[PDB]
Amino acid sequence: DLGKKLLEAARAGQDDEVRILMANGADVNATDASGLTPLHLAATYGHLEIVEVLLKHGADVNAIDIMGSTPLHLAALIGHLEIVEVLLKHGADVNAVDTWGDTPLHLAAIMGHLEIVEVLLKHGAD
Amino acid sequence: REVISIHVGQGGIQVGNACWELFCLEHGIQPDGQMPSDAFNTFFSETGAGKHVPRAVFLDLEPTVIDEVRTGTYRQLFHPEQLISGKEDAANNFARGHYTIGKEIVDLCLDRIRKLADNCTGLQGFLVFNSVGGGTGSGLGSLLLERLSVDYGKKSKLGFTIYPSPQVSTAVVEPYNSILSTHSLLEHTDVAVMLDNEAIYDICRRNLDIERPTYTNLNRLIAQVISSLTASLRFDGALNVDITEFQTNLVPYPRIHFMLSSYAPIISAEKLSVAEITNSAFEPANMMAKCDPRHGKYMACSMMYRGDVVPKDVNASIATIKTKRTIQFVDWCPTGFKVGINYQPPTVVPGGDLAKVMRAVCMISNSTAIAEVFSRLDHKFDLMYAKRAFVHWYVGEGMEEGEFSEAREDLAALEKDYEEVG
Amino acid sequence: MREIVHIQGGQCGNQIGAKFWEVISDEHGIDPTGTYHGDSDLQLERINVYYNEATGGRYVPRAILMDLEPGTMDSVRAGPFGQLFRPDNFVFGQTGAGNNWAKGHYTEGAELIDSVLDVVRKEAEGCDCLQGFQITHSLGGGTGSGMGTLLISKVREEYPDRIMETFSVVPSPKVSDTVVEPYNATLSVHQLVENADECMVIDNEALYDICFRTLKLTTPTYGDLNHLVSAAMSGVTCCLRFPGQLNSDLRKLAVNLIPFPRLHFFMIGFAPLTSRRALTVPELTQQMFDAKNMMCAADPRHGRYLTASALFRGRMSTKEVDEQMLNVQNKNSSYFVEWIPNNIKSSICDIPPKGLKMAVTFVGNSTAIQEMFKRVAEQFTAMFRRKAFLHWYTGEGMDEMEFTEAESNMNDLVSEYQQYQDATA
Ligand SMILES: Nc1nc2c(ncn2[C@@H]2O[C@H](COP(=O)(O)OP(=O)(O)OP(=O)(O)O)[C@@H](O)[C@H]2O)c(=O)[nH]1
Ligand SMILES: Nc1nc2c(ncn2[C@@H]2O[C@H](COP(=O)(O)OP(=O)(O)OP(=O)(O)O)[C@@H](O)[C@H]2O)c(=O)[nH]1
Ligand SMILES: [Mg+2]
Ligand SMILES: [Mg+2]
């Protein structure tokens, strides 16, 4: 199943495997059992180039998993600055709230990612 | 009629260091055991080579304090078999001294005590020196009391027992050890003399004008009291001549046997009459336990004078004190007031703090006022025990938690006992 | 009670450990060849507590050096006193643990633990009377954290009657922005609650704040942080290393500080704080209590002390210490529980630390430390709810339920601090 192979290559940072799967018809917006997408997984594990290629090919920047987590939540939690900015550039919802009541700003603050906090605030985080 | 002294833990050993220093000076014994120039044989054996040896053991669960004896001024005075030390101490934990650590050395302690008793024509009893606030004197001391009650069933035991003060305290659990010890002393001593560090420290600070006193300062004062109280054991006298007479003269009810003592005059070596020192002996400022004996009643009082003291002058001072009526005895009590005079004045210790005096008095009494000392420690105990603070340290070293409430209840009963007598 | 066996594990463990040995060897007059030079006989009276005596008359740290990576120990070997450590007490792998508490506790660390235990046993069995063990490590990495707690568990089993003490470095994003560190530290705190008697907390959040705000260092290097750590460690251990009576060994220290066995994490304050005129006694007593002087990023005025000890060092008056200790207890009466009588005690050690004539170390058991555990717990919970990097741990064979068990044990610790904080007499 190409969707699940794409999920796993996005999670693992296998750039060439992503490009090959996408070129053979892989579903850019495939979901795993909890609703995580390839963009969610690359944002979490820090793979900037895969994040950008997915966004250039129809990835939903504001997809939520079953817990309401957006890719921007995960990038701000883990501390990937350049990914936070790319997601914002492509219309990520800066004030998305997950099922725990957290925003990306709250997660970045908790984890002490101060530059990300400042970027989120400049983009209107509440 | 020999008497064997048992010194347990730091406080007991260092008070013993001061007592034996004074005993040697009073009997003219040098640290060598030699005597250039019977009664003093109650406290010393004698060897074929003319050595006079204390009838004593020093017992500790760590070697630091014992090593200082083994290597100090009196290294020649004791046989090495008399000086027993463990490797790791009780860590201020009654349970460690009584159970897990003390159990490994008590037989060795009882064998050395048995060697002393085997050299006694007619052993009459034991003096047991310890503090209650630590773990070794309290816990191993109480365990030794239990075993001595079984092995020497017919022999009297008199405690010289150090109670704690915030001013010279290194352990928050002191009230626990104090109550557990006092429960042991209630059952396994016939008499116990309360050496309350709170009062003794204050006497050194005030009467002796020592700004922050050392244990040596406190201990040299204690030794003068203990020497006065044991004067009739070691010399010819007529009041408290054997250990058993302490109980008969001072204890009307078996478990009410904790004694308040005093000394007069307590004056520094920088720069009084029979009547004056007799008044001073009834003053809080001269009491070795922190209480007001004017607020209580006396079951018993023994006054032991030393030195240039005429019997008629004692009788006159006591007559006057009786009329003043502040000092009250329990009506119809089967014990009461007794007086004794030894005509030798107290001995001066080189480098001591106490001024040379031609007469002195030491009182030992059974007063209800002593309940104040127990009441303060019981209250501290109660605050901590209500949260079971620190209790796990004792339960983990072989004590059942039930022994806490058993001891506390014993102390509650003793407090009610004093209240009813009042 | 005499000898202590020291083990330093991982990068943090070995760096703060090396500084400890430098600082106390100077205090004791020991040079890098192990030869004593000094005046006071107080320096050698309890030298056996941390040092073995060799044939040569030289003194050798009773120290084991452990890591899954050879790097930091190689630089320890090259450091000032590196040639004084027993060469056969270096136990190192080649792999590393990759900041993964599982690699340290269950896989790479598990493959090396027998070689560590071999050396530890050899030192322990050679002691006249062993007091216990001292472990220096970070809780946020993989080796010091995961393999350190494995070692604590194994030694606890073989030596259940001896005292287990740690100097544990708590992580902070201010110092290392590495997001699995809350996992590693929560897993370790779980271990520490069950298997250690005494934990001397060293909070990188607090060290960072001290270096930034009070010492005005804009970007604090590990050297800057460790300058504070070594000052605290010398001051905390002074009572074990020099003649005295208060807290004079690990077991007596424990009996004074720990009313409830799980609550064995201590807040340490010290004064003066220094970078790499003497203070008066009123200044020492005020500063030692101040949030700005604590090694734990918890505000002592947000909780109550169960117990505490103030260990003064230098030529100062007993009278004046008594006077000021009465003053600070009166002024801070709201921050001590009322149901433990005389729960604050003090002592004076005549030997001051290097470059100072007056100093103090305040060691306390305060319910305020719950603030530090709550900080780590919030980060743990943020990561764990999104299951970020969890496969790194279950991939080494660890069960996810261990995450929930540790999280719950540390949450119960916080609950218990709050119970005694609100208790009344
Ligand atoms: N009066 C007097 N009290 C002492 C002396 N030494 C210790 N104490 C008191 O004894 C209590 C402390 O117990 P220690 O006797 O030192 O303890 P220990 O029996 O050696 O038991 P561990 O050390 O816990 O094994 C406190 O109340 C001290 O003030 C002393 O020389 N004279
Ligand atoms: N105060 C202080 N913290 C340190 C030091 N070195 C590392 N740390 C902190 O310790 C944590 C990382 O743990 P390390 O000691 O480096 O890791 P390790 O134990 O060597 O484990 P692995 O490298 O994963 O095998 C982070 O929180 C760092 O900030 C140090 O010298 N001083
Ligand atoms: Mg002792
Ligand atoms: Mg490392």
Author numbering:
A (entry chain F): 13 to 138
B (entry chain A): 2 to 38, 47 to 280, 286 to 436
C (entry chain B): 1 to 42, 45 to 278, 284 to 360, 369 to 440
How is this structure described in the published paper?
MTs are assembled from αβ‐tubulin heterodimers and undergo phases of growth and shrinkage, a property termed dynamic instability (reviewed in Akhmanova and Steinmetz (2015)). Recent advances in the structural characterization of tubulin– and MT–agent complexes have led to the identification of six distinct drug‐binding sites in mammalian tubulin (reviewed in Steinmetz and Prota (2018)). Similarly, dinitroaniline compounds disrupt specifically plant and protozoan parasite MTs but not mammalian MTs (Fennell et al, 2008). These observations imply that fine structural differences in the architecture of drug‐binding sites between protozoan and mammalian tubulin could be exploited to develop novel parasite‐specific anti‐tubulin drugs. In this work, we provide a structural description of apicomplexan tubulin drug‐binding sites together with the comparison to their mammalian counterparts and use this information to rationally design a parasite‐specific tubulin inhibitor dubbed “parabulin”.
As attempts to produce recombinant apicomplexan tubulin similar to what has been achieved for human tubulin (Ti et al, 2016) have proved unsuccessful, we decided to isolate tubulin dimers from the free‐living ciliate Tetrahymena thermophila, as its tubulin is abundantly expressed and nearly identical (87–95% identity) to apicomplexan tubulins. Ciliates and apicomplexans both belong to the alveolate group (Dorrell et al, 2013), and their tubulins are sensitive to dinitroanilines (Lyons‐Abbott et al, 2010), suggesting that T. thermophila tubulin can be used as a proxy to study the interaction of ligands with apicomplexan tubulin. We solved the structures of T. thermophila αβ‐tubulin in complex with DARPin1 (D1; (Pecqueur et al, 2012)) at 1.75 Å resolution and paclitaxel‐stabilized T. thermophila MTs at 3.3 Å resolution. The overall structure of T. thermophila tubulin is similar to that of human (RMSD of 0.49 Å over the 751 Cα atoms of curved αβ‐tubulin, and RMSD of 0.77 Å over the 801 Cα atoms of straight αβ‐tubulin) or yeast tubulin (Ayaz et al, 2014) (RMSD of 0.73 Å over the 755 Cα atoms of curved αβ‐tubulin, and RMSD of 0.796 Å over the 789 Cα atoms of straight αβ‐tubulin). The most prominent differences between T. thermophila and human tubulin were observed for the colchicine site that is located at the α‐β intra‐tubulin dimer interface (Ravelli et al, 2004). Notably, the residues of human tubulin of the colchicine site among different human tubulin isoforms are overall largely conserved (AppendixFigs S3 and S4). However, as shown in Fig 2A and Fig EV2A, we observed amino acid differences in all the three zones of the T. thermophila colchicine site compared to all human isoforms. Based on structural modeling, we observed that rings A and B of CA4 could be similarly accommodated in the T. thermophila tubulin structure.
